[PDB]
Amino acid sequence: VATLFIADLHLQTEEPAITAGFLRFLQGEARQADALYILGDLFEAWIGDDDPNPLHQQIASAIKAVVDAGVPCYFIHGNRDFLVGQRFARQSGMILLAEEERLDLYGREVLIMHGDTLCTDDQGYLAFRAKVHTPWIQRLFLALPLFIRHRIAARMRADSKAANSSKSMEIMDVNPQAVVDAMERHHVQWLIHGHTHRPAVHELQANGQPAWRVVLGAWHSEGSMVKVTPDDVELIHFPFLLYFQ
Numbered sequence: 001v002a003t004l005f006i007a008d009l010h011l012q013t014e015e016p017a018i019t020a021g022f023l024r025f026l027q028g029e030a031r032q033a034d035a036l037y038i039l040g041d042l043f044e045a046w047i048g049d050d051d052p053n054p055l056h057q058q059i060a061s062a063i064k065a066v067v068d069a070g071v072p073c074y075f076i077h078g079n080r081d082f083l084v085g086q087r088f089a090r091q092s093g094m095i096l097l098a099e100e101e102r103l104d105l106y107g108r109e110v111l112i113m114h115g116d117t118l119c120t121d122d123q124g125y126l127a128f129r130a131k132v133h134t135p136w137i138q139r140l141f142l143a144l145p146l147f148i149r150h151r152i153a154a155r156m157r158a159d160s161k162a163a164n165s166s167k168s169m170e171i172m173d174v175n176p177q178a179v180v181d182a183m184e185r186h187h188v189q190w191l192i193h194g195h196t197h198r199p200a201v202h203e204l205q206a207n208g209q210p211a212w213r214v215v216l217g218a219w220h221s222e223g224s225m226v227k228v229t230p231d232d233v234e235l236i237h238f239p240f241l242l243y244f245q
């Protein structure tokens with residue numbers, strides 16, 4: 001038995017190969033887990049649950065089949081899809097969780113999050129995140145016509161793509177002090193997150209004991225997942241979908 005953790009799939013229409021790899025994962029590996037946690041950035045973009053984007057319903061139906069197969073699915077918002085709301089949760093059967101959750105996984109206490117709130121050195125993103133996460137700014141954006149939200153989101157992506165082109169990767173990683181503060185705020189020796197796209201297992205010190213930070217990988221050329229069993233924690237890389245010469 002095991003619990004699965006995925007994040008940073010960045011599903012979008014222009015990347016059907018990633019979509020097909022995620023659909024195969026939901027039909028096979030996901031059906032065998034006690035639970036499936038999606039730690040943010042499931043979608044490359046999200047402007048509201050009323051978006052009739054067909055990929056949204058194709059993904060919701062596939063996740064609903066996993067939930068119907070007896071595997072509960074949970075979602076934590078990422079920096080790309082923080083607008084995923086209760087309507088999509090019902091369409092997909094997923095349970096939406098807070099920005100930080102503490103799980104009892106077979107005895108070990110694990111803190112789960114997306115990981116973007118750990119990059120406290122990036123003042124540019126932190127200001128952008130505080131703005132787009134303010135409730136009244138959200139409900140104003142969501143009240144606009146959908147085609148207006150599309151033009152807003154398209155320009156903001158082009159704006160941030162040209163602004164991030166002049167940023168150093170030293171202020172864009174995880175802050176080590178923020179990890180210890182989070183792992184001691186929740187009193188855990190285990191932390192799983194994504195966002196940074198650097199799959200790794202980092203050892204640190206928290207609560208006077210050794211602690212570990214498990215980072216998920218983004219779904220680029222191949223898939224990535226964290227598998228937590230009663231015996232071990234596994235960081236797994238696998239292809240989306242054999243011959244001889």
Ligand SMILES: CC(=O)N1CCc2cc(S(=O)(=O)N3CCN(c4cccc(C(F)(F)F)c4)CC3)ccc21
Pocket residue numbers: 044045046047079080081083125128132133137138141152153154156157160
């Ligand atoms: C660093 C980073 O995370 N970025 C950089 C660029 C980007 C674009 C998108 S998005 O295209 O999915 N879309 C953009 C618009 N957005 C929004 C929400 C609430 C209020 C408003 C405002 F401001 F218009 F009122 C806009 C919803 C999501 C998501 C993440 C990110």
Ligand SMILES: [Mn+2]
Pocket residue numbers: 007008009010041194195196197218
């Ligand atoms: Mn990501």
Ligand SMILES: [Mn+2]
Pocket residue numbers: 008040041078079080114116194195196
């Ligand atoms: Mn992210």
